[PDB]
Design a binder for these strands. Structure first.
Ligand SMILES: [K+]
Ligand SMILES: [Mg+2]
Ligand SMILES: [Mg+2]
Ligand SMILES: [Mg+2]
Ligand SMILES: [Mg+2]
Ligand SMILES: [Mg+2]
Ligand SMILES: [Mg+2]
Ligand SMILES: [Mg+2]
Ligand SMILES: [Mg+2]
Ligand SMILES: [Mg+2]
Ligand SMILES: [Mg+2]
Ligand SMILES: [Mg+2]
Ligand SMILES: [Mg+2]
Ligand SMILES: [Mg+2]
Ligand SMILES: [Mg+2]
Ligand SMILES: [Mg+2]
Ligand SMILES: [Mg+2]
Ligand SMILES: [Mg+2]
Ligand SMILES: [Mg+2]
Ligand SMILES: [Mg+2]
Ligand SMILES: [Mg+2]
Ligand SMILES: [Mg+2]
Ligand SMILES: [Mg+2]
Ligand SMILES: [Mg+2]
Ligand SMILES: [Mg+2]
Ligand SMILES: [Mg+2]
Ligand SMILES: [Mg+2]
Ligand SMILES: [Mg+2]
Ligand SMILES: [Mg+2]
Ligand SMILES: [Mg+2]
Ligand SMILES: [Mg+2]
Ligand SMILES: [Mg+2]
Ligand SMILES: [Mg+2]
Ligand SMILES: [Mg+2]
Ligand SMILES: [Mg+2]
Ligand SMILES: [Mg+2]
Ligand SMILES: [Mg+2]
Ligand SMILES: [Mg+2]
Ligand SMILES: [Mg+2]
Ligand SMILES: [Mg+2]
Ligand SMILES: [Mg+2]
Ligand SMILES: [Mg+2]
Ligand SMILES: [Mg+2]
Ligand SMILES: [Mg+2]
Ligand SMILES: [Mg+2]
Ligand SMILES: [Mg+2]
Ligand SMILES: [Mg+2]
Ligand SMILES: [Mg+2]
Ligand SMILES: [Mg+2]
Ligand SMILES: [Mg+2]
Ligand SMILES: [Mg+2]
Ligand SMILES: [Mg+2]
Ligand SMILES: [Mg+2]
Ligand SMILES: [Mg+2]
Ligand SMILES: [Mg+2]
Ligand SMILES: [Mg+2]
Ligand SMILES: [Mg+2]
Ligand SMILES: [Mg+2]
Ligand SMILES: [Mg+2]
Ligand SMILES: [Mg+2]
Ligand SMILES: [Mg+2]
Ligand SMILES: [Mg+2]
Ligand SMILES: [Mg+2]
Ligand SMILES: [Mg+2]
Ligand SMILES: [Mg+2]
Ligand SMILES: [Mg+2]
Ligand SMILES: [Mg+2]
Ligand SMILES: [Mg+2]
Ligand SMILES: [Mg+2]
Ligand SMILES: [Mg+2]
Ligand SMILES: [Mg+2]
Ligand SMILES: [Mg+2]
Ligand SMILES: [Mg+2]
Ligand SMILES: [Mg+2]
Ligand SMILES: [Mg+2]
Ligand SMILES: [Mg+2]
Ligand SMILES: [Mg+2]
Ligand SMILES: [Mg+2]
Ligand SMILES: [Mg+2]
Ligand SMILES: [Mg+2]
Ligand SMILES: [Mg+2]
Ligand SMILES: [Mg+2]
Ligand SMILES: [Mg+2]
Ligand SMILES: [Mg+2]
Ligand SMILES: [Mg+2]
Ligand SMILES: [Mg+2]
Ligand SMILES: [Mg+2]
Ligand SMILES: [Mg+2]
Ligand SMILES: [Mg+2]
Ligand SMILES: [Mg+2]
Ligand SMILES: [Mg+2]
Ligand SMILES: [Mg+2]
Ligand SMILES: [Mg+2]
Ligand SMILES: [Mg+2]
Ligand SMILES: [Mg+2]
Ligand SMILES: [Mg+2]
Ligand SMILES: [Mg+2]
Ligand SMILES: [Mg+2]
Ligand SMILES: [Mg+2]
Ligand SMILES: [Mg+2]
Ligand SMILES: [Mg+2]
Ligand SMILES: [Mg+2]
Ligand SMILES: [Mg+2]
Ligand SMILES: [Mg+2]
Ligand SMILES: [Mg+2]
Ligand SMILES: [Mg+2]
Ligand SMILES: [Mg+2]
Ligand SMILES: [Mg+2]
Ligand SMILES: [Mg+2]
Ligand SMILES: [Mg+2]
Ligand SMILES: [Mg+2]
Ligand SMILES: [Mg+2]
Ligand SMILES: [Mg+2]
Ligand SMILES: [Mg+2]
Ligand SMILES: [Mg+2]
Ligand SMILES: [Mg+2]
Ligand SMILES: [Mg+2]
Ligand SMILES: [Mg+2]
Ligand SMILES: [Mg+2]
Ligand SMILES: [Mg+2]
Ligand SMILES: [Mg+2]
Ligand SMILES: [Mg+2]
Ligand SMILES: [Mg+2]
Ligand SMILES: [Mg+2]
Ligand SMILES: [Mg+2]
Ligand SMILES: [Mg+2]
Ligand SMILES: [Mg+2]
Ligand SMILES: [Mg+2]
Ligand SMILES: [Mg+2]
Ligand SMILES: [Mg+2]
Ligand SMILES: [Mg+2]
Ligand SMILES: [Mg+2]
Ligand SMILES: [Mg+2]
Ligand SMILES: [Mg+2]
Ligand SMILES: [Mg+2]
Ligand SMILES: [Mg+2]
Ligand SMILES: [Mg+2]
Ligand SMILES: [Mg+2]
Ligand SMILES: [Mg+2]
Ligand SMILES: [Mg+2]
Ligand SMILES: [Mg+2]
Ligand SMILES: [Mg+2]
Ligand SMILES: [Mg+2]
Ligand SMILES: [Mg+2]
Ligand SMILES: [Mg+2]
Ligand SMILES: [Mg+2]
Ligand SMILES: [Mg+2]
Ligand SMILES: [Mg+2]
Ligand SMILES: [Mg+2]
Ligand SMILES: [Mg+2]
Ligand SMILES: [Mg+2]
Ligand SMILES: [Mg+2]
Ligand SMILES: [Mg+2]
Ligand SMILES: [Mg+2]
Ligand SMILES: [Mg+2]
Ligand SMILES: [Mg+2]
Ligand SMILES: [Mg+2]
Ligand SMILES: [Mg+2]
Ligand SMILES: [Mg+2]
Ligand SMILES: [Mg+2]
Ligand SMILES: [Mg+2]
Ligand SMILES: [Mg+2]
Ligand SMILES: [Mg+2]
Ligand SMILES: [Mg+2]
Ligand SMILES: [Mg+2]
Ligand SMILES: [Mg+2]
Ligand SMILES: [Mg+2]
Ligand SMILES: [Mg+2]
Ligand SMILES: [Mg+2]
Ligand SMILES: [Mg+2]
Ligand SMILES: [Mg+2]
Ligand SMILES: [Mg+2]
Ligand SMILES: [Mg+2]
Ligand SMILES: [Mg+2]
Ligand SMILES: [Mg+2]
Ligand SMILES: [Mg+2]
Ligand SMILES: [Mg+2]
Ligand SMILES: [Mg+2]
Ligand SMILES: [Mg+2]
Ligand SMILES: [Mg+2]
Ligand SMILES: [Mg+2]
Ligand SMILES: [Mg+2]
Ligand SMILES: [Mg+2]
Ligand SMILES: [Mg+2]
Ligand SMILES: [Mg+2]
Ligand SMILES: [Mg+2]
Ligand SMILES: [Mg+2]
Ligand SMILES: [Mg+2]
Ligand SMILES: [Mg+2]
Ligand SMILES: [Mg+2]
Ligand SMILES: [Mg+2]
Ligand SMILES: [Mg+2]
Ligand SMILES: [Mg+2]
Ligand SMILES: [Mg+2]
Ligand SMILES: [Mg+2]
Ligand SMILES: [Mg+2]
Ligand SMILES: [Mg+2]
Ligand SMILES: [Mg+2]
Ligand SMILES: [Mg+2]
Ligand SMILES: [Mg+2]
Ligand SMILES: [Mg+2]
Ligand SMILES: [Mg+2]
Ligand SMILES: [Mg+2]
Ligand SMILES: [Mg+2]
Ligand SMILES: [Mg+2]
Ligand SMILES: [Mg+2]
Ligand SMILES: [Mg+2]
Ligand SMILES: [Mg+2]
Ligand SMILES: [Mg+2]
Ligand SMILES: [Mg+2]
Ligand SMILES: [Mg+2]
Ligand SMILES: [Mg+2]
Ligand SMILES: [Mg+2]
Ligand SMILES: [Mg+2]
Ligand SMILES: [Mg+2]
Ligand SMILES: [Mg+2]
Ligand SMILES: [Mg+2]
Ligand SMILES: [Mg+2]
Ligand SMILES: [Mg+2]
Ligand SMILES: [Mg+2]
Ligand SMILES: [Mg+2]
Ligand SMILES: [Mg+2]
Ligand SMILES: [Mg+2]
Ligand SMILES: [Mg+2]
Ligand SMILES: [Mg+2]
Ligand SMILES: [Mg+2]
Ligand SMILES: [Mg+2]
Ligand SMILES: [Mg+2]
Ligand SMILES: [Mg+2]
Ligand SMILES: [Mg+2]
Ligand SMILES: [Mg+2]
Ligand SMILES: [Mg+2]
Ligand SMILES: [Mg+2]
Ligand SMILES: [Mg+2]
Ligand SMILES: [Mg+2]
Ligand SMILES: [Mg+2]
Ligand SMILES: [Mg+2]
Ligand SMILES: [Mg+2]
Ligand SMILES: [Mg+2]
Ligand SMILES: [Mg+2]
Ligand SMILES: [Mg+2]
Ligand SMILES: [Mg+2]
Ligand SMILES: [Mg+2]
Ligand SMILES: [Mg+2]
Ligand SMILES: [Mg+2]
Ligand SMILES: [Mg+2]
Ligand SMILES: [Mg+2]
Ligand SMILES: [Mg+2]
Ligand SMILES: [Mg+2]
Ligand SMILES: [Mg+2]
Ligand SMILES: [Mg+2]
Ligand SMILES: [Mg+2]
Ligand SMILES: [Mg+2]
Ligand SMILES: [Mg+2]
Ligand SMILES: [Mg+2]
Ligand SMILES: [Mg+2]
Ligand SMILES: [Mg+2]
Ligand SMILES: [Mg+2]
Ligand SMILES: [Mg+2]
Ligand SMILES: [Mg+2]
Ligand SMILES: [Mg+2]
Ligand SMILES: [Mg+2]
Ligand SMILES: [Mg+2]
Ligand SMILES: [Mg+2]
Ligand SMILES: [Mg+2]
Lengths: 275, 48
RNA sequence: CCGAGGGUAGGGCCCGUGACUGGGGCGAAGUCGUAACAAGGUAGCUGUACCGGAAGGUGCGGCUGGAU
RNA sequence: UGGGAGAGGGUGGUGGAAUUCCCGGAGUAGCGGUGAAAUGCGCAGAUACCGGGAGGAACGCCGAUGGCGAAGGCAGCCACCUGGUCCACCCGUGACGCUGAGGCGCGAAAGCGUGGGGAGCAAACCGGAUUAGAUACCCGGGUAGUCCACGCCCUAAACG
RNA sequence: CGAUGUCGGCUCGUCGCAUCCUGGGGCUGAAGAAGGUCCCAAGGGUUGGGCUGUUCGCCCAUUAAAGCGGCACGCGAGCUG
RNA sequence: GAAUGCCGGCAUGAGUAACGAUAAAGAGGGUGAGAAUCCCUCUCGCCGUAAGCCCAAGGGUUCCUACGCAAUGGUCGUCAGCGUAGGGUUAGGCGGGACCUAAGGUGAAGCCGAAAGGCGUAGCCGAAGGGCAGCCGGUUAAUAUUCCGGCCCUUCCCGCAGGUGCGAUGGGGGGACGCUCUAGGCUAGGGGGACCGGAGCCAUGGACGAGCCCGGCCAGAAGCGCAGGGUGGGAGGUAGGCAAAUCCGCCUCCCAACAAGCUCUGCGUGGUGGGGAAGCCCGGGUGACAACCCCCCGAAGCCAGGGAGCCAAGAAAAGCCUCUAAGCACAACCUGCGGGAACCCGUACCGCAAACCGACACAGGUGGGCGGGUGCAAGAGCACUCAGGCGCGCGGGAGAACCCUCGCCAAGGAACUCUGCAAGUUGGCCCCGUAACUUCGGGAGAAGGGGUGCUCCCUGGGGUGAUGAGCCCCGGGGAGCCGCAGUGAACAGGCUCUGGCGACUGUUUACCAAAAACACAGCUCUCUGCGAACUCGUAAGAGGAGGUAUAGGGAGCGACGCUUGCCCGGUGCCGGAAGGUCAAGGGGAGGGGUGCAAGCCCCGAACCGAAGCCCCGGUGAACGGCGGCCGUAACUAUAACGGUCCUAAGGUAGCGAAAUUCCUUGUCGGGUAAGUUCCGACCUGCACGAAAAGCGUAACGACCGGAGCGCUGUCUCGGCGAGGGACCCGGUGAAAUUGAACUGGCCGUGAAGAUGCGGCCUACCCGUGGCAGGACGAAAAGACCCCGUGGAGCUUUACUGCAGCC
RNA sequence: GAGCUAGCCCUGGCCAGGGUGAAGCUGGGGUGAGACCCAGUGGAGGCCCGAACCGGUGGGGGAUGCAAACCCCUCGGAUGA
């Protein structure tokens, strides 16, 4: 439930911050963090390949467990719920009865103290991980593997969820968070429930410097540049686009589809997204 | 105001020094060229 | 010391007046349509919303103070 | 104390009918629409028919001149939470009552904000027709909205 | 065109006279006073402000009068910009 | 003999400008051939959050001493960062290496690329980060945490004793972390003392004093004290920490818990060892058996890995501890003690600068620490001062114009001017008081005012101490005193009303533009299902992202409020399994060449045959576009209304002579005595209009308009004064420019603006200070314009290619 | 050639002093319970004033300069993009 400020500065007028009410532990599990190498959006050549990146807060990366079929049958206790700056969701600290400690992204409704488990025999309960074929149709799930053993790929962002629509052979029909209808393999794992921290979308950054903290450097409109720089550059005074609206590299950017024509995964998309 | 030559011994040796020249094909051509001209110094002198 | 009052500065209320602008009342025989009273020829009224030269129309919900 | 009837309210679930859409099949020259038509849709295979799926909304028969609520208003079914109310017994208190300027709360529809949702319907809008005109009535489309949550708005032929 | 800096202002003047004022005249449809028109005359004089970059013009308050032109539309190795 | 030729030499300008911050000098005595300039002394002035001191980088002998003065030094020079020569830099503990990792670099494995090469896991490298043992004083002309003295410590080797399951590149723990705020107790540092030590002083009217002046410490092992930091004990189970594990993790039980214990730091004390001023006398010596004490202030530093809050969620690796594995337990480790061993590089000096970066001994630039006292509310601000360091490497005169920097001004007070440009005014603190409007924060330091010093008296509270005295810190009330004036000097807002633009704090054209431009939170569209899209790359590989549609790319709009209409005919994009065209390929009706012939060989129609295009639809916060003429009302005028032509559709709401309006200073109104600007209106909008967003909007702005108040040298209109120059004298001595010059005015003439030609007029020869009208003055082979079948950036439905994509 | 400059990466460092006084918490009031109000405490912010430091607004000087971008006055930011 987002938190507001009083208008005691021009920026505090609109700034909203997460309430952090679900967080129960305010420092990371030392054995589960590693240094996150910052890039600035530079690649191994040294070249900016993603514009407008850099200068954000230092972060440590928390190792998240996107498999969970590592530990089939071994229950775990929800020990804590912590902040993770590398994703929109919160993460949950799990003390296994094994004695091993791991991190999962925290689904909505997970309570510290409850116990979770993973496998074909698991209760259809919030926080458990099963191969998609053993989840009843209509269940809202998250952290879905796109291929078996390959790792949880889909529905990881705060408040997202895919919903099982039905089964076909070895495959299950999921409705992704985008509204696409895909056939995901039944042996692919997934976790019951939707990802937590749904109010994430309602945050107002409030001022420029907030974006600077998140590593987001200022973004320049092509219309503001010169012809050497961008299809929309130049012109005396202001100027309409004066051609089909284009990216810095020439290709059009209002409607032009770019999914690869002959992609082999097309046999498994049932319906493109809507809205 | 701040001028352009801001001397630095480590910078100087890492950029123009002997080992920097030898590591790449252009740098070895520099040394070949400067030897052929008979330069008394193949490489900037830096007190290191 | 207090002190009529004079001065400087800032406020509140009222009055008159002002390019222009808003609708209102009225005015023997102007222009446009015909909304309402008959089921007034799309039953009417209605709070609201949007729209249209104009009366109005339409939507949503409501009332009969609606005819057959 | 004992009982009773009820669409009174709130929350969570969940059932079938229908419309639309999508997929498969079967099938051919029209369908639709009206006062009559036209726009529209259809040989790029529509309509009509069968099987399959997705989704939203409203709950047929029961249904009543019925019932409940202070009013607005409330109708599939199930469970939980909760208000009012009537009757019986004639047990307890002993006038503890009535009304009520202010105050506070509730308050159909439309409307507003932030998210969601969107099948059907449909202001605005577009087209077809009627007409002297037709910014209407009729027809084919169609966006808000209608639905959900939270928060506003506080109006009414809020009427007996 | 192997460069003659280009509007206006400021400062500093100097010349012309087709004279705005002041001096001298003739004619008058000159009673007087005031004026009109023309002739002679360049000695001196020819104000302060509002508006605009302005020159120019309009306007306010005066004045004997509030002249018009040349000097590389006088004058940036004098200033301004 | 000319090429703004090339190289050199030497002239002109000229004894001219200048001699590099306006912090400032004067005298005496030395030295020497020679002295404003070197040495010494006294007087004066300048810095003092430095213009003093200590590190680091860079510099590289510049350091110290002797002897020198040709050149260097903007003058001089006897002096010097200059010439010659000799000397000078000393470490187990400081810094770096024999330790560790960061980005990055490199890179056994592996991958990729015509070659050269590009990637790349481990590993290796890589520091101003982590880790690690030295403090104080003395000494040299010149080094010192390095030598010496005192007191401390570290590691390695060996030995002795005691103890233990010893043993690692492997497991684990720890190392190990942000921002703001902040407690307690200390220390550094500082103020005072009527207390302690000191050579001495009594002046010029007074003072022999509880007088003046000076100083009153630093380091220290173990113990001990104070303040902190870190830290549960035990047992049972165990399937996790890629073998093992008694460690760690997880579970259960008992005990302990604001503690304590244990451990580790800081501070104090501490055997002991050092230091020790003014003044005097010649760096020293004396003072001096120097004294070394009490109170207060007190850190941003220390305890430290302390505490609280917040979101943007804050390195690694080794040292170190623990666990075991091979192994080995005659070993090995751990603890105490002893002897021995302990290498390489730097160390001078400059270091906000005359030694570094700027061609210079250049008013510029250069990271870290210390940076004293008083007063002013505070402070690193300001003024003056300590320690310390300087007077800026040309001087002496004079007292013109004119320039710069500065002070003052009668009356007026913006009349100046494009503009109050500039300069006044205002100015700190305390108190009173404060409007429209508003997003309820604000606007606000609104505006406007009053107070401010010194002396006496009475008194409230706090810190330290003890509850008191003393010292210190906030106050309150009463009575007075002086001046023109009490933030008496220095530092320290002028204000208001009203428009345009942009919400705002930010960002920009290094070196003519700081803005209304860019950015910005926010809104919309679009693409992307993850080996994502997109980007860089031939590729491998990277970024995206160790992210997953509440996410990532692209685009436009630009807080917020109220809103964003109509057009899909053209272009773009999206959808469409029909049709039309459609290349290679398939096909092979039918021809052809050659051979005697089997054959060999060439051409080739129908028909099949993709994407693209055509075609059919959709689509505007996609590219874009959103009419003309004529008539009409009972005064007139104007047309709600009508007629007709055209369109894909004819501009909606809201704005409007506007950052847009040509005619234009539109017209009307306001403000002024007067208003081409301004504000408010009207609407025939040359040529607004809705995310190239429309209309508004509190707050904000070194933005751009208009007005008022205050106050002024801006002005009427100028005057005087100060200093630095200009001027004169001694010293040193440039520059662009320059065909040669014996270089006047007028009216003419001339390639059309003549010192140089003609005619006339004027004029003795040469300078110095001044002024700028001419020498079509200087500078730059016009940057505007044209020309060149000259060049370059940029565009597109110009041509033709290529990448990329299909 | 990134020892200037532009961005990013790693690792350190710096920002006198003064002012305003958000959330929260505590108490009091209020109520069926609440919202809420008041006081104190608190110490938020691309908050306010102002050195260091980073800048470069206006004017003057400078213009063969002290300087191939400097000097004086004045002015912007100064816990943050
Ligand atoms: K031109
Ligand atoms: Mg508020
Ligand atoms: Mg949370
Ligand atoms: Mg680790
Ligand atoms: Mg990376
Ligand atoms: Mg690399
Ligand atoms: Mg590289
Ligand atoms: Mg990019
Ligand atoms: Mg980038
Ligand atoms: Mg994320
Ligand atoms: Mg999170
Ligand atoms: Mg699959
Ligand atoms: Mg959130
Ligand atoms: Mg968002
Ligand atoms: Mg960040
Ligand atoms: Mg962004
Ligand atoms: Mg932008
Ligand atoms: Mg954008
Ligand atoms: Mg542009
Ligand atoms: Mg531009
Ligand atoms: Mg470029
Ligand atoms: Mg381009
Ligand atoms: Mg363009
Ligand atoms: Mg442009
Ligand atoms: Mg334009
Ligand atoms: Mg532009
Ligand atoms: Mg265009
Ligand atoms: Mg384009
Ligand atoms: Mg592409
Ligand atoms: Mg999809
Ligand atoms: Mg620079
Ligand atoms: Mg540098
Ligand atoms: Mg170096
Ligand atoms: Mg270095
Ligand atoms: Mg370097
Ligand atoms: Mg090298
Ligand atoms: Mg290199
Ligand atoms: Mg080679
Ligand atoms: Mg050489
Ligand atoms: Mg040699
Ligand atoms: Mg070389
Ligand atoms: Mg009086
Ligand atoms: Mg008539
Ligand atoms: Mg009438
Ligand atoms: Mg009628
Ligand atoms: Mg009708
Ligand atoms: Mg209308
Ligand atoms: Mg309608
Ligand atoms: Mg058909
Ligand atoms: Mg067919
Ligand atoms: Mg649906
Ligand atoms: Mg009874
Ligand atoms: Mg209501
Ligand atoms: Mg029609
Ligand atoms: Mg008709
Ligand atoms: Mg009724
Ligand atoms: Mg010319
Ligand atoms: Mg020339
Ligand atoms: Mg020239
Ligand atoms: Mg010219
Ligand atoms: Mg003048
Ligand atoms: Mg007369
Ligand atoms: Mg005259
Ligand atoms: Mg004029
Ligand atoms: Mg003219
Ligand atoms: Mg004019
Ligand atoms: Mg007269
Ligand atoms: Mg003239
Ligand atoms: Mg001329
Ligand atoms: Mg002319
Ligand atoms: Mg002309
Ligand atoms: Mg000039
Ligand atoms: Mg001029
Ligand atoms: Mg000239
Ligand atoms: Mg100009
Ligand atoms: Mg010749
Ligand atoms: Mg020559
Ligand atoms: Mg020459
Ligand atoms: Mg030449
Ligand atoms: Mg030459
Ligand atoms: Mg020569
Ligand atoms: Mg020679
Ligand atoms: Mg010479
Ligand atoms: Mg000479
Ligand atoms: Mg001369
Ligand atoms: Mg000179
Ligand atoms: Mg000079
Ligand atoms: Mg100075
Ligand atoms: Mg001074
Ligand atoms: Mg003297
Ligand atoms: Mg002297
Ligand atoms: Mg001598
Ligand atoms: Mg001398
Ligand atoms: Mg001499
Ligand atoms: Mg001297
Ligand atoms: Mg001396
Ligand atoms: Mg003397
Ligand atoms: Mg001081
Ligand atoms: Mg000499
Ligand atoms: Mg000599
Ligand atoms: Mg000499
Ligand atoms: Mg000699
Ligand atoms: Mg010399
Ligand atoms: Mg010099
Ligand atoms: Mg030495
Ligand atoms: Mg030693
Ligand atoms: Mg060795
Ligand atoms: Mg290493
Ligand atoms: Mg190649
Ligand atoms: Mg290296
Ligand atoms: Mg190393
Ligand atoms: Mg190191
Ligand atoms: Mg060391
Ligand atoms: Mg020590
Ligand atoms: Mg010696
Ligand atoms: Mg840690
Ligand atoms: Mg960590
Ligand atoms: Mg660190
Ligand atoms: Mg933070
Ligand atoms: Mg000490
Ligand atoms: Mg003190
Ligand atoms: Mg324990
Ligand atoms: Mg085990
Ligand atoms: Mg320590
Ligand atoms: Mg003695
Ligand atoms: Mg500090
Ligand atoms: Mg600080
Ligand atoms: Mg600490
Ligand atoms: Mg690492
Ligand atoms: Mg043995
Ligand atoms: Mg042991
Ligand atoms: Mg060695
Ligand atoms: Mg040394
Ligand atoms: Mg030094
Ligand atoms: Mg400096
Ligand atoms: Mg320094
Ligand atoms: Mg020096
Ligand atoms: Mg000098
Ligand atoms: Mg210097
Ligand atoms: Mg200090
Ligand atoms: Mg002192
Ligand atoms: Mg002060
Ligand atoms: Mg001096
Ligand atoms: Mg000097
Ligand atoms: Mg100085
Ligand atoms: Mg003189
Ligand atoms: Mg001065
Ligand atoms: Mg004065
Ligand atoms: Mg005086
Ligand atoms: Mg005066
Ligand atoms: Mg005045
Ligand atoms: Mg006045
Ligand atoms: Mg004025
Ligand atoms: Mg002005
Ligand atoms: Mg101006
Ligand atoms: Mg002043
Ligand atoms: Mg002041
Ligand atoms: Mg007012
Ligand atoms: Mg107010
Ligand atoms: Mg206002
Ligand atoms: Mg208010
Ligand atoms: Mg105040
Ligand atoms: Mg005041
Ligand atoms: Mg007083
Ligand atoms: Mg006094
Ligand atoms: Mg007096
Ligand atoms: Mg101020
Ligand atoms: Mg005002
Ligand atoms: Mg701007
Ligand atoms: Mg701005
Ligand atoms: Mg705007
Ligand atoms: Mg705004
Ligand atoms: Mg903005
Ligand atoms: Mg700022
Ligand atoms: Mg510039
Ligand atoms: Mg420029
Ligand atoms: Mg430049
Ligand atoms: Mg400038
Ligand atoms: Mg600015
Ligand atoms: Mg810009
Ligand atoms: Mg922008
Ligand atoms: Mg917006
Ligand atoms: Mg590429
Ligand atoms: Mg490529
Ligand atoms: Mg990655
Ligand atoms: Mg984006
Ligand atoms: Mg824009
Ligand atoms: Mg269109
Ligand atoms: Mg179309
Ligand atoms: Mg189209
Ligand atoms: Mg086109
Ligand atoms: Mg095709
Ligand atoms: Mg068009
Ligand atoms: Mg509209
Ligand atoms: Mg207008
Ligand atoms: Mg306008
Ligand atoms: Mg404009
Ligand atoms: Mg216009
Ligand atoms: Mg105009
Ligand atoms: Mg005009
Ligand atoms: Mg006018
Ligand atoms: Mg007027
Ligand atoms: Mg106006
Ligand atoms: Mg008009
Ligand atoms: Mg546009
Ligand atoms: Mg535009
Ligand atoms: Mg637009
Ligand atoms: Mg508003
Ligand atoms: Mg505004
Ligand atoms: Mg405003
Ligand atoms: Mg601004
Ligand atoms: Mg500004
Ligand atoms: Mg004014
Ligand atoms: Mg003057
Ligand atoms: Mg003077
Ligand atoms: Mg003389
Ligand atoms: Mg001389
Ligand atoms: Mg000389
Ligand atoms: Mg000659
Ligand atoms: Mg001659
Ligand atoms: Mg001559
Ligand atoms: Mg002459
Ligand atoms: Mg002629
Ligand atoms: Mg002539
Ligand atoms: Mg002559
Ligand atoms: Mg002649
Ligand atoms: Mg002749
Ligand atoms: Mg002659
Ligand atoms: Mg003459
Ligand atoms: Mg002379
Ligand atoms: Mg002269
Ligand atoms: Mg001249
Ligand atoms: Mg001149
Ligand atoms: Mg001339
Ligand atoms: Mg010439
Ligand atoms: Mg000339
Ligand atoms: Mg000239
Ligand atoms: Mg030039
Ligand atoms: Mg040339
Ligand atoms: Mg030329
Ligand atoms: Mg040129
Ligand atoms: Mg031309
Ligand atoms: Mg020609
Ligand atoms: Mg040609
Ligand atoms: Mg030609
Ligand atoms: Mg050409
Ligand atoms: Mg080219
Ligand atoms: Mg190619
Ligand atoms: Mg650099
Ligand atoms: Mg600061
Ligand atoms: Mg500060
Ligand atoms: Mg307070
Ligand atoms: Mg708190
Ligand atoms: Mg406080
Ligand atoms: Mg504030
Ligand atoms: Mg600030
Ligand atoms: Mg303030
Ligand atoms: Mg600067
Ligand atoms: Mg400046
Ligand atoms: Mg000024
Ligand atoms: Mg210059
Ligand atoms: Mg300066
Ligand atoms: Mg200054
Ligand atoms: Mg400030
Ligand atoms: Mg900070």
């Amino acid at each position: 439930a987002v938190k507001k400020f009083k208008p005691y500065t021009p920026s505090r007028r609109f700034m909203t911050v997460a309430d952090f009410s679900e967080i129960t532990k305010t420092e990371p599990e030392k054995s589960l963090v590693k240094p996150l190498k910052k890039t600035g959006g530079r690649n191994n050549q040294g070249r900016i390949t993603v514009r407008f990146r850099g200068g954000g807060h230092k972060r440590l990366y928390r190792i998240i467990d996107f498999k969970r079929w590592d530990k089939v049958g071994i229950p775990a206790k929800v020990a804590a719920i912590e902040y993770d700056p590398n994703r929109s969701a919160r993460i949950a600290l799990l003390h296994y009865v094994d004695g091993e400690k791991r991190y999962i992204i925290a689904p909505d409704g997970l309570q510290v103290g409850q116990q979770v488990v993973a496998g074909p025999d698991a209760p259809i309960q919030v926080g458990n991980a099963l191969p998609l074929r053993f989840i009843p149709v209509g269940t809202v799930v998250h952290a879905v593997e796109l291929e078996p053993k390959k790792g949880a790929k889909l529905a990881r962002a705060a408040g997202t969820s895919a919903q099982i629509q039905g089964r076909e052979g070895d495959y299950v029909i999921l409705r992704l968070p985008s509204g696409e209808l895909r056939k995901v393999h039944g042996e692919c794992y997934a976790t019951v429930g939707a990802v937590g921290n749904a109010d994430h979308k309602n945050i107002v950054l409030g001022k420029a410097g907030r974006s600077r903290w998140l590593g987001r450097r200022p973004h320049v409109r092509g219309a503001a540049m010169n012809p050497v720089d961008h299809p929309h550059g130049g012109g005396e005074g202001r100027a309409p686009r004066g051609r089909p609206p284009a990216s810095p590299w020439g290709w059009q950017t209002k409607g032009l589809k770019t999914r690869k024509r002959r992609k082999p995964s097309s046999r498994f998309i049932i319906a493109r997204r809507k809205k | 105001m701040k001028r352009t030559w801001q001397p630095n011994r480590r910078k100087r040796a890492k950029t123009h020094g002997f080992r920097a020249r030898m590591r790449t094909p252009g740098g070895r051509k520099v040394l070949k060229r400067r030897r052929q001209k008979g330069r008394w110094r193949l490489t900037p002198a830096v007190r290191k």
